[PDB]
Design an enzyme around this catalytic site. Sequence first.
Site, PDB file in Angstrom:
ATOM      1  CG  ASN A 121      42.586  38.471  46.608  1.00  0.00           C
ATOM      2  OD1 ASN A 121      41.808  38.748  45.694  1.00  0.00           O
ATOM      3  ND2 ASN A 121      42.537  37.320  47.267  1.00  0.00           N
ATOM      4  NE  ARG A 272      41.492  30.143  41.048  1.00  0.00           N
ATOM      5  CZ  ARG A 272      42.084  30.735  42.079  1.00  0.00           C
ATOM      6  NH1 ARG A 272      43.143  31.516  41.916  1.00  0.00           N
ATOM      7  NH2 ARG A 272      41.594  30.554  43.302  1.00  0.00           N
ATOM      8  CD  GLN A 300      47.385  26.954  43.013  1.00  0.00           C
ATOM      9  OE1 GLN A 300      47.697  27.764  42.139  1.00  0.00           O
ATOM     10  NE2 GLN A 300      47.035  27.322  44.238  1.00  0.00           N
ATOM     11  CG  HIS A 326      48.135  30.903  44.114  1.00  0.00           C
ATOM     12  ND1 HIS A 326      46.931  30.259  44.307  1.00  0.00           N
ATOM     13  CD2 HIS A 326      47.834  32.209  43.918  1.00  0.00           C
ATOM     14  CE1 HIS A 326      45.946  31.137  44.233  1.00  0.00           C
ATOM     15  NE2 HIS A 326      46.468  32.327  43.998  1.00  0.00           N
TER      16      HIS A 326
HETATM   17  N1  NAP Z   1      46.212  34.957  41.972  1.00  0.00           N
HETATM   18  C1  NAP Z   1      45.487  35.169  43.070  1.00  0.00           C
HETATM   19  O1  NAP Z   1      45.986  35.146  44.184  1.00  0.00           O
HETATM   20  C2  NAP Z   1      44.020  35.447  42.920  1.00  0.00           C
HETATM   21  C3  NAP Z   1      43.318  36.093  43.927  1.00  0.00           C
HETATM   22  C4  NAP Z   1      41.964  36.331  43.739  1.00  0.00           C
HETATM   23  C5  NAP Z   1      41.342  35.919  42.566  1.00  0.00           C
HETATM   24  N2  NAP Z   1      42.043  35.299  41.611  1.00  0.00           N
HETATM   25  C6  NAP Z   1      41.397  34.861  40.370  1.00  0.00           C
HETATM   26  O2  NAP Z   1      40.862  35.971  39.636  1.00  0.00           O
HETATM   27  C7  NAP Z   1      39.551  35.628  39.169  1.00  0.00           C
HETATM   28  C8  NAP Z   1      38.574  36.785  39.109  1.00  0.00           C
HETATM   29  O3  NAP Z   1      39.054  37.891  39.858  1.00  0.00           O
HETATM   30  P1  NAP Z   1      37.934  38.930  40.351  1.00  0.00           P
HETATM   31  O4  NAP Z   1      37.673  38.610  41.801  1.00  0.00           O
HETATM   32  O5  NAP Z   1      38.305  40.331  39.927  1.00  0.00           O
HETATM   33  O6  NAP Z   1      36.651  38.417  39.520  1.00  0.00           O
HETATM   34  P2  NAP Z   1      35.332  39.318  39.304  1.00  0.00           P
HETATM   35  O7  NAP Z   1      35.467  40.552  40.165  1.00  0.00           O
HETATM   36  O8  NAP Z   1      34.117  38.434  39.443  1.00  0.00           O
HETATM   37  O9  NAP Z   1      35.437  39.784  37.765  1.00  0.00           O
HETATM   38  C9  NAP Z   1      35.382  38.796  36.733  1.00  0.00           C
HETATM   39  C10 NAP Z   1      35.124  39.429  35.370  1.00  0.00           C
HETATM   40  O10 NAP Z   1      35.374  38.477  34.330  1.00  0.00           O
HETATM   41  C11 NAP Z   1      34.313  38.505  33.371  1.00  0.00           C
HETATM   42  N3  NAP Z   1      34.125  37.137  32.820  1.00  0.00           N
HETATM   43  C12 NAP Z   1      33.481  36.124  33.422  1.00  0.00           C
HETATM   44  N4  NAP Z   1      33.495  35.003  32.653  1.00  0.00           N
HETATM   45  C13 NAP Z   1      34.167  35.296  31.525  1.00  0.00           C
HETATM   46  C14 NAP Z   1      34.551  34.572  30.289  1.00  0.00           C
HETATM   47  N5  NAP Z   1      34.210  33.274  30.100  1.00  0.00           N
HETATM   48  N6  NAP Z   1      35.254  35.251  29.355  1.00  0.00           N
HETATM   49  C15 NAP Z   1      35.600  36.540  29.530  1.00  0.00           C
HETATM   50  N7  NAP Z   1      35.286  37.258  30.623  1.00  0.00           N
HETATM   51  C16 NAP Z   1      34.581  36.704  31.640  1.00  0.00           C
HETATM   52  C17 NAP Z   1      33.091  38.997  34.131  1.00  0.00           C
HETATM   53  O11 NAP Z   1      32.233  39.768  33.290  1.00  0.00           O
HETATM   54  P3  NAP Z   1      30.981  39.110  32.520  1.00  0.00           P
HETATM   55  O12 NAP Z   1      30.222  38.371  33.598  1.00  0.00           O
HETATM   56  O13 NAP Z   1      30.254  40.298  31.935  1.00  0.00           O
HETATM   57  O14 NAP Z   1      31.616  38.205  31.494  1.00  0.00           O
HETATM   58  C18 NAP Z   1      33.676  39.870  35.226  1.00  0.00           C
HETATM   59  O15 NAP Z   1      33.610  41.245  34.842  1.00  0.00           O
HETATM   60  C19 NAP Z   1      38.999  34.573  40.102  1.00  0.00           C
HETATM   61  O16 NAP Z   1      38.218  33.627  39.370  1.00  0.00           O
HETATM   62  C20 NAP Z   1      40.239  33.906  40.634  1.00  0.00           C
HETATM   63  O17 NAP Z   1      40.393  32.725  39.867  1.00  0.00           O
HETATM   64  C21 NAP Z   1      43.352  35.057  41.766  1.00  0.00           C
END
Ligand code: NAP
Lengths: 374, 374
Positions: A121, A272, A300, A326
Amino acid sequence: MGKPKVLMALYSGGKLAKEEPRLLGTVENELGIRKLVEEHGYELVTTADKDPFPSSTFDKNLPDAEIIITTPFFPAYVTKERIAKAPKLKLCVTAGVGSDHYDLNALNERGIAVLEVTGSNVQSVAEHAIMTMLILLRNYGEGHAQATQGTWDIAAVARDEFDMEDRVFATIGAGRIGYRILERLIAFNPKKLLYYQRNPLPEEAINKLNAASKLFNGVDNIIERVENLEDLVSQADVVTLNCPLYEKSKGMFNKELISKMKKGSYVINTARGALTDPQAIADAVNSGHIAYGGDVWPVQPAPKDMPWRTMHNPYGKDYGNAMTVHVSGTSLDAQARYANGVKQILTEYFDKTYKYRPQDVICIDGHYATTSYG
Amino acid sequence: MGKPKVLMALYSGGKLAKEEPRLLGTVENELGIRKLVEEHGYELVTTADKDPFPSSTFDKNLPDAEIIITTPFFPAYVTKERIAKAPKLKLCVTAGVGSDHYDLNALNERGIAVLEVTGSNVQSVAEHAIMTMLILLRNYGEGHAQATQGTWDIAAVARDEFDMEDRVFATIGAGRIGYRILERLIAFNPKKLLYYQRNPLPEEAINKLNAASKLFNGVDNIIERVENLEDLVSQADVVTLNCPLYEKSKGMFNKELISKMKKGSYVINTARGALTDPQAIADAVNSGHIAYGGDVWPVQPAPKDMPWRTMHNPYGKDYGNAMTVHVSGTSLDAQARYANGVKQILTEYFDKTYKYRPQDVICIDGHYATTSYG
Ligand SMILES: NC(=O)c1ccc[n+]([C@@H]2O[C@H](COP(=O)([O-])OP(=O)(O)OC[C@H]3O[C@@H](n4cnc5c(N)ncnc54)[C@H](OP(=O)(O)O)[C@@H]3O)[C@@H](O)[C@H]2O)c1
Ligand SMILES: NC(=O)c1ccc[n+]([C@@H]2O[C@H](COP(=O)([O-])OP(=O)(O)OC[C@H]3O[C@@H](n4cnc5c(N)ncnc54)[C@H](OP(=O)(O)O)[C@@H]3O)[C@@H](O)[C@H]2O)c1
């Protein structure tokens, strides 16, 4: 001493899902994984009855659950207490992306494997974040309201209506979704793109954005890393949250950090809900200091009385609130992706080969297997 | 035998405009052109009282109007009848972009010059068209409604929720706004981009989109010209109108052309409302054959009973309608641009140098001076 149980908690779609086979993420359609689960001698228990602990259908089928399947849009909270009475749990699979609703630490202590359909997604949420930005900046709420309630008050809309062009966009997290938001911003001619995470972006990623900026707008060096969190939100007109709920990110977007933003700024959070101080967000929207939009909530399904459901800027009810239930990760195109993703994870497990995609692994063998949680 | 009159019709913003100086497109703030108009011995008459012909304040000041200034978001319709009793009219200036509300033919017959601030809002409308696309495809209306009215019906939203990715977008008109919509679509990874106009796009324009497609998505030859109008709307999931109301474009998007679109398609129209058969649009939205969004209407201000104000898909009131009151071209950033634009046009005229920007000229010396009208 019955068959081993696959316990799946999804939202219900009733007659809609019974007549729309693309609604795979529903109890009615069961992600299309029933044949596979039964081919291998497992009992598939699908239910939308996930709350009142410990009386729910979900809770009552924990003692024999070997595999648990959840979904973030309607999530069974697999807490330590619940893990403690699922004595033969081996695997937890998220139908989608986002696994904060498990107690990942308690699962590691038991050797539980935890999988997601990483990447199913990423484009869908990035579209949702851009849509939210456009809706808040351009004052769609009042513009749509004026058309809906029969009037024509141009000035009421335009008084809070800004272009995306020449605004400063900052993202907390430049991962798969964050970076994909930056990519779709380039053609909007931003003044500057900022990002904040613990590690610096790769070089070819910085080069791709700068190359896109040069082609579309004739501008170079549009991306820039800020290392102080207050410094990032001070400079920005629009900040997106695209990082995970990882314990010290709990409530990071609090009263103080909001106060450091310019009056009339914008906060998007498709990540989140618990990344924010939820009441501090409501206070700052109702005071007009910020506008807020997103689809993720701290709990949720969200309570009826949840303050985000009635947030609005002083200018009016339809100013500054772009909340949705959501849904971004569960568009029909996304549901097809992560239903097939859950099928592949189960195939690998049932065939006892376990050739999972490594990006899909959240926990395994008693340890975290990713930086996206901890 | 008084001073020569500048007659300006803008919308009113009352206390909002009196306290927000950026609301330059209002009667209250007069585009900032009062000093200039009086420096040159002219009487500036600004009014929001533009209808009941012939009794309006606007009509009553026609006999001595030398310069007429209008604005498309709240437009004084300068018809043949009204031009016939403005015997000393020399110049008409549009505070913004879009001059269909003049009788351009009757103005040519009198040698009247007609100017716009071409390009002042091209980016603003393109943002509005993209926002509309995202809102309809992703079912923001029901997603926002569910959050607003206290519930959590994920399946109701997702049942009509699609990604922008892998959809086919077609534009009727690839001018400044149309092409800018294509540019912002590239990073959304479309399946294909189609366009339809009377002349083929320049080469470096086709090359810019293809280059952007290659960089972002690794895809090439994403743009393609379709020459049959029915053929364009048959292939598309999303068609945008970005062309002008030029007589035979009157009502072109009619019952038949709508019928040739796939069921569940999308129509965006930030161009001119009169390009459509307005009741045919309403019929096709209420039947669920299409969803519709945009900010331009056939008559402005729109009647209370205008069918577009209550259009919705059968699935519910918040399905398939993304109408707004006409605001895209009048964001605060846009208002600053076209207020300065009207000032430069008046300076050239008052100083009797007439070094207008040629792209700003719509009519002059008795002839059309552009392809955007006729
Ligand atoms: N709304 C929806 O339907 C939906 C769907 C899917 C996911 N999501 C949400 O989106 C989030 C992540 O999406 P994704 O799958 O793209 O994640 P991802 O691919 O793992 O990317 C997360 C990025 O955030 C950075 N990060 C981690 N901790 C951090 C902090 N404390 N402060 C600043 N940056 C930080 C990481 O880099 P570093 O490790 O270098 O910090 C990483 O580059 C998920 O946790 C989920 O909660 C929502
Ligand atoms: N919503 C707002 O606030 C707002 C603001 C400004 C403008 N507008 C509207 O947007 C319209 C145009 O925007 P723009 O300033 O970008 O116009 P533009 O720069 O003149 O571009 C118009 C394009 O449409 C094409 N075209 C003309 N007639 C056509 C037809 N019958 N069928 C298909 N294509 C046709 C033209 O190409 P060919 O000559 O080769 O066909 C041209 O490339 C204006 O007419 C106005 O109504 C709305």
